[PDB]
């Protein structure tokens, strides 16, 4: 009668950067979806929350990361932008829910919290659920960069620099994306 480790994901003291977003595989456990899902941004896709306690799934993937407030709208199916195309992409037929909450009291420092990073440049768009942690010098021109930060050769990652004095559109938001997978296999993650 193992209980699903949702506390470890939502109540983690430190979250991952969006470009290197973390995923927790949850399987073979009992979950209190209804009791854990009752100032939170909550959007579900392809499935209803009042019905999750009645469904079993093959695997439930828990993706967690941090973006700024103006970018939460991109964590959704069929969205475009720097976060959706280059950091964390959700498929068009995504079945799951997205949860976000303002974490300005946890992830913002007076001198600036430059620890959280995001990808700015990439040659192509990310596939759904793709994670690219490569930090190779991006070639924006014709000449080969060869690991040289120069003209048309820039570093592909930048910092959020979360400061508490910023506006809500620039304040940190911790995002937890729960994917509900139902392939073949046996259904082990049942709600109760």
């Amino acid at each position: 009668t193992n209980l699903c480790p949702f506390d470890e994901v939502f109540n983690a003291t430190r979250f991952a950067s969006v470009y290197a977003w973390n995923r927790k595989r949850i399987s073979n456990c009992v979950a209190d979806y209804s009791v854990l899902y009752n100032f939170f941004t909550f959007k579900c896709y392809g499935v209803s929350p009042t019905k999750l306690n009645d469904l079993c799934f093959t695997n439930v993937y828990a993706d967690s990361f941090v973006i700024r407030g103006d970018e939460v709208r991109q964590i959704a199916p069929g969205q475009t932008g720097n976060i959706a195309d280059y950091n964390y992409k959700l498929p068009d037929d995504f079945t799951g829910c997205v949860i976000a909450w303002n974490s300005n009291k946890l992830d913002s420092k007076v001198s600036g919290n430059y620890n959280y990073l995001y990808r700015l440049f990439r040659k192509s768009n990310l596939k759904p659920f793709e994670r690219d942690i490569s930090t190779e010098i991006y070639q924006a021109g014709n000449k080969p960069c060869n690991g040289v930060a120069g003209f048309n050769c820039y570093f592909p990652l930048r910092s959020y620099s979360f400061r508490p004095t910023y506006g809500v559109g620039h304040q940190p938001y911790r995002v937890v994306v729960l994917s509900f997978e139902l392939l073949h296999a046996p259904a082990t993650v049942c709600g109760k």
Partner: nanobody, 124 residues
Framework: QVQLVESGGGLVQAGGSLRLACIAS????????MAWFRQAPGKEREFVAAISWSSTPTYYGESVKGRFTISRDNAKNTVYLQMNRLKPEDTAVYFCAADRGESYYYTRPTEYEFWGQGTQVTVS
């Protein structure tokens, strides 16, 4: 980008009926949770009703529960609001809204990406 156009509003006597309709652009209407909000002058947008993809969870604001019925016809890209036993307090601009996601916080305007311009309902 989805466009939404409400129709069926206008003047009606107390105790009367109106069916609001709202039609969406696109060929993926089935992928949208559809909702109705209303706004009386001086007040914020108040949640009225919402319908999930399958039609199967429907939701209602406290003050319209029992009097109003939301329904959808995917073949016509249309969501309907049947408003029965209308009272003067139902007078407002009625807004159609749509989102890919079904929200736990289904009464929050911020959970819906797409909004119609609204249509006046007046109950005398």
């Amino acid at each position: 980008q989805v466009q939404l156009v409400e129709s069926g509003g206008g003047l009606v006597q107390a105790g009367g009926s109106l069916r609001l309709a709202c039609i969406a652009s696109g060929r993926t209407f089935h992928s949208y949770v559809m909702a109705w909000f209303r706004q009386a002058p001086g007040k914020e947008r108040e949640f009225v009703a919402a319908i999930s993809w399958s039609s199967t969870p429907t939701y209602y604001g406290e003050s319209v529960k029992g009097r109003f019925t939301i329904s959808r016809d995917n073949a016509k890209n249309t969501v309907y609001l049947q408003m029965n036993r209308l009272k003067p307090e139902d007078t407002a601009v009625y807004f159609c809204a749509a989102d890919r996601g079904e929200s736990y916080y289904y009464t929050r305007p911020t959970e819906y990406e797409f909004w119609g311009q609204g249509t006046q309902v007046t109950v005398s």
